[PDB]
Amino acid sequence: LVDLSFEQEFQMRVMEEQVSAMSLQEARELLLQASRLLMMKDNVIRSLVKRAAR
Amino acid sequence: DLSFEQEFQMRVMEEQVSAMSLQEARELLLQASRLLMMKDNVIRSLVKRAAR
């Protein structure tokens, strides 16, 4: 199971602080850095689930 | 290491962002941040079956 802890909810309130004062350029570079990171995360997971089975 | 399908999605993503409003670019940056944490939780789980 996986869902947001207390402190991560805190982290979400902080990112929201810093995003609201972001320029169009900064929000776009970071979002792209985030989307790429999301895919590299799927790969760590997939690779971890395989490595457990076998 | 992005697979071949992922590199491709990236390109589609560079093309969407570049057209995004400052408004959507923010909403979505948050969502992606939530997701990264959710995925980090999943990764932490699977690593915990380190119970051996």
Cα distance between residue B16 and residue B32, in whole Å = 15
Determine the residue type at A33: Q
Q: Phi, psi (5° rounding) for residue B20?
A: -70, 150
DSSP H helical ranges for chain B: 4-17, 22-48
Query: A48 touching B, CB under 8 A?
Result: yes
Resolution in A: 2.5
- State how far the Cα of B2 lies from the Cα of A43, in Å rounded to an integer: 8
Cβ contact A34–B36 (<8 Å): yes
Q: How many distinct structural domains can be found in chain B?
A: 1
Q: CA torsion, points A20, A26, A32, A34, in degrees to nearest 10?
A: -50
Domain range for A14: 1-54
Of B6, B17, B42, nearest to A45 by CB-CB distance is B42
CB A45 within 8 A of CB A52: no
What is the SS3 assignment for B45?
A: helix
First and final C-alpha spacing in chain B: 28
Please count the CA atoms within 13 angstroms of the CA of A48 that sit on its side-chain side: 17
Tokens 């792209």: give the residue: A32
What CA–CA distance (Å, rounded) separates A24 from A14? Answer: 19
CATH code, domain carrying B13: 1.10.287.670
